[PDB]
Design a binder for this molecule. Sequence first.
Ligand code: HEM
Length: 184
Amino acid sequence: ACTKNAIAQTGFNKDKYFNGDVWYVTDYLDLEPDDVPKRYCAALAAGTASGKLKEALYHYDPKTQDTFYDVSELQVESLGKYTANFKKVDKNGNVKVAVTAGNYYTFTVMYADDSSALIHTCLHKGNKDLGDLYAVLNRNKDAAAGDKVKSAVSAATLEFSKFISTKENNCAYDNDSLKSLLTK
Ligand code: HEM
């Protein structure tokens, strides 16, 4: 279960974050791991599409090859804090699993600038017991975490040394499908 009320970034710039571009997860911290995808690739696009606030998600497990995309319309709770009901889609946006109540994630932007970000998410998916997940994002899939975002990890009272890197998984992403999915 989740246990954190993540604090959104003071003066969070929503139009800059939600500009329709892609963010890559470079490092993550799951507060309830198992034994676990210690190996994992993830990326998202975030933008406004025809006046609606949207995110498109991509997950890939580089060992099992388990692959899935999601699209969500985000609802605002407060600045930098959202509730997202998701639908699993193929890369082209055709629905595989429809939106349903009980399938949602919260999303908090704790820190962001033009190249990097720190987010918290709490996933809810039917029957599952899932925990808090923090992710360090960058606009460049290969970028080592900078002092700006590492300071934010500290300020959130976390230790960046506990985060797991995704960079040794040689992830490759379809940026084009992530951007396109924002409209779907
Ligand atoms: C690198 C970090 C990531 C890891 C390692 C990870 C891992 C996973 C795994 C293992 C599941 C499958 C859960 C279940 O079915 O048992 C999953 C699903 C999901 N994750 Fe992540 N995730 C990460 C990042 C993200 C981010 C950044 C978000 C939100 C922005 C997110 C949103 C979701 C959603 C919505 C699902 C359910 C999708 C569906 O069933 O259609 N994940 N994640």
